[PDB]
Structure formats: structure tokens, C-alpha cells
Amino acid sequence: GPHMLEREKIYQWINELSSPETRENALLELSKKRESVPDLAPMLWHSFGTIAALLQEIVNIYPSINPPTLTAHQSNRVCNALALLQCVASHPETRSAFLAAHIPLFLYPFLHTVSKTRPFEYLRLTSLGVIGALVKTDEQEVINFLLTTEIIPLCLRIMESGSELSKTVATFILQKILLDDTGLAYICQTYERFSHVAMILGKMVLQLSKEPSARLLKHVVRCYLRLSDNPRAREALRQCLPDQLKDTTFAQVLKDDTTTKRWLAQLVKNLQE
Amino acid sequence: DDLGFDPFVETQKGLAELMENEVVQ
């Protein structure tokens, strides 16, 4: 019945992705089925010409990066394609082949952009969401893939100059990398990697003291707390920890957040030892 | 392990207003 007619329409939309004359409408309809159709990612991945058609939408926006000329209509169409790629990135049947094809690298030109226009800010936000869905799988394969790319410097620049939503996702991505044992060891491997992160995190604390954000501060504190697990990083944090994290600067913005207050108390306790 | 929001849903919300305020008569 209706379950059948919906599945037949999805197969029709997937085939319509291969034609430029019908791809825009197919992108719109399929992105609506991202949450309700658990088998969507294998159906997209089944023919690689479908994935090539999705990537063609991605590649078509590269000329809009310099100078930043991306419009809201152009950004919305590609974000729909990114939403379908996010489906493939998070499904356990397609996640490994998705990483083996290095598909996330097609999004890195978007993450490298610095334009503060809304079409680019939301393009980075949706692009960060694809990476965010990858680290939510809690797979070792995801962390190893991200460490062989330049995702850390891309996230750090967004964490200091992006919008609040983009800073939150970018900080969450860094948080998930740090929570992995190899990711923490990677950032503490050299002086430059750790100092770059500590400088960015400290700058965000300064920005948060002027414009408070409970959701962003939660992930910043979690990054600091995880860094304190490394002995060399713990000694460095005893000297460079922002005073706003030791004072009652954020007591009002955390008046209802019991989780961040517990992490902040654990962080200062890890540094006193 | 969550952000408190959906980045793609918030993108659709933000770009819907700008798409209507960028087009020409």
C-alpha cells in the first residue's frame, strides 16, 4: 500500500538524480526522507553514478568560493546534497566505503572558506554536520581518517571566527577527536598542535565571557577536561588556563547546566593535583 | 554526545528567509 508507493517513489527519485533536468527536485524530495528511511544510504550507494551525481552538485559550487558569490538558493540546493551524503556517512553498511572513497574531502574547500555571508556560514554548518555525524558513530576508523586529513586546523579557525552554531559543531568534532586515545595523543604529539588548540580554546573562553553561550561552553570545557588527562598537557594547563574558568564568570550562564559545572569542577581538581 | 540542535535543520530555517529576501521582482 502506502509503504510500497513511497519506496517506489524513492527509487524513481534516486534515478532522477542522474539527470541534471530532474536532479534539483530529486535532491529536495530525498532529503526529506533522510530520517524516515533507514535503508536510504544503501539505496544511494548501490549505483555509484548516484554518488557521482551528488558529488557533482558539490563540485558545481567550487567556483563560488573566490570571491564569495554563493547565494542562498545555491547554498540550499547543495546542503540538500550534503544531507544525503550525511546519510551515507552514518549508516553502518556504507560508512566504511564512504571513508575509503575519501568523500569528506570534497567538503573541505567549504570548511576552508572564511566568508561571513549566510550562504557560506550555513554551508560550513551543514558541512560540519556531515563530519559531526561521522564522529557520532564512535568508530576508530573515523578518527584515523580524520587524523590523516587537515580537519583539526579547519575546525580551529571556525571555532574562533564562525557563528555560534558552527563553533558548537566544530568544537564538538574536536571534542570527539580528543576523547579518542589516539586523538589526544595526536594533539599532544607536538608543541605546535597543543599550543594552537590551547590558544584557540583560551580565545573562545574570552569571547564567551563577553557573549555567554551555555551550549558552546559545554564543549569547550569538555575539551579542556579531556586535555587534562595527558600529563604534559596538564602541566601546561596549570599556567595557561583562562581565569574565567577558575572564577565565577560563567556561574550565571550555567545556573541550570549541572553537567558543565561538574566538568569544570573536575577540570580544576585535575589541575590542582 | 549531542549538540542540542540539528545543523541541517537550522540551515534550512536560515536559508528559507534569505532565499525570499534575495530574489528580484
Q: What is the dihedral of CA A111, A113, A117, A120, to 10 degrees?
A: -40
A243: nearest Cα among A261, A264, A266, A226: A264
Annotate A104-116 with b (16+ C-beta within 10 A) or e (fewer): bebbeebbebebe
* Measured CA distances, A221 to A27, A91, A199, A229 (Å): 38, 30, 14, 13
The phi and psi torsions of A135 (rounded to 5 degrees) equal -75, -20
Interface test with A, best of B2, B15, B17, B23 (most A CBs within 10 A): B15
Please judge whether A165 and B15 are an interchain contact, meaning their C-beta atoms are less than 8 angstroms apart: no
Please judge whether A79 and B12 are an interchain contact, meaning their C-beta atoms are less than 8 angstroms apart: yes
Nearest to A72 among B6, B8, B15 (CB): B15
Give the total residue count for chain B: 25
Supply the angle between the helices A118-136 and A140-147 in degrees, to the nearest 10: 130
Q: Write out the three cell numbers for A59.
A: 563540485
| Structure resolution, Å | 2.1
Residue A184: HSE in the Cβ half-sphere, 13 Å Cα cutoff: 17
CB contact B12 to A (< 8 Å)? yes
Cα A169 from Cα A162, distance rounded (Å)? 10
Domains of chain A with CATH codes? 1-273 (1.25.10.10)
Cα A247 from Cα A113, distance rounded (Å)? 35
Cα A261 from Cα A18, distance rounded (Å)? 51
By what method was this entry solved?
Answer: X-ray
A133: nearest Cα among A263, A35, A213: A35
Look at residue B4 and give its three-state secondary structure. coil
CB contact A45 to B (< 8 Å)? no
Residue A154 burial (10 A CB sphere; 0-12, 13-18, 19+): buried
Which residues on A lie below 8 Å from B15 (Cβ)? 72, 75-76, 79, 118-119, 122
Domain boundaries, chain B: 1-25
CB contact B15 to A (< 8 Å)? yes
CA-based max dimension of chain B? 45
Give the total residue count for chain A: 273
What is the distance in angstroms between the Cα of A76 and the nearest Cα belonging to chain B?
6
Instruction: Decide: A84 and A30 in contact? Cβ < 8 Å.
Output: yes
Cα A172 from Cα A159, distance rounded (Å)? 10
Contacts 24+ apart (CB under 8 A), A159-162: A159/A200, A159/A201, A159/A204, A160/A200, A160/A203, A160/A204, A160/A207, A161/A114, A161/A116, A162/A121, A162/A124
Supply the angle between the helices A118-136 and A151-161 in degrees, to the nearest 10: 130
Annotate A172-207 with b (16+ C-beta within 10 A) or e (fewer): bbbbbbbbbeebbebbbeeeeebeebbebbbebbeb
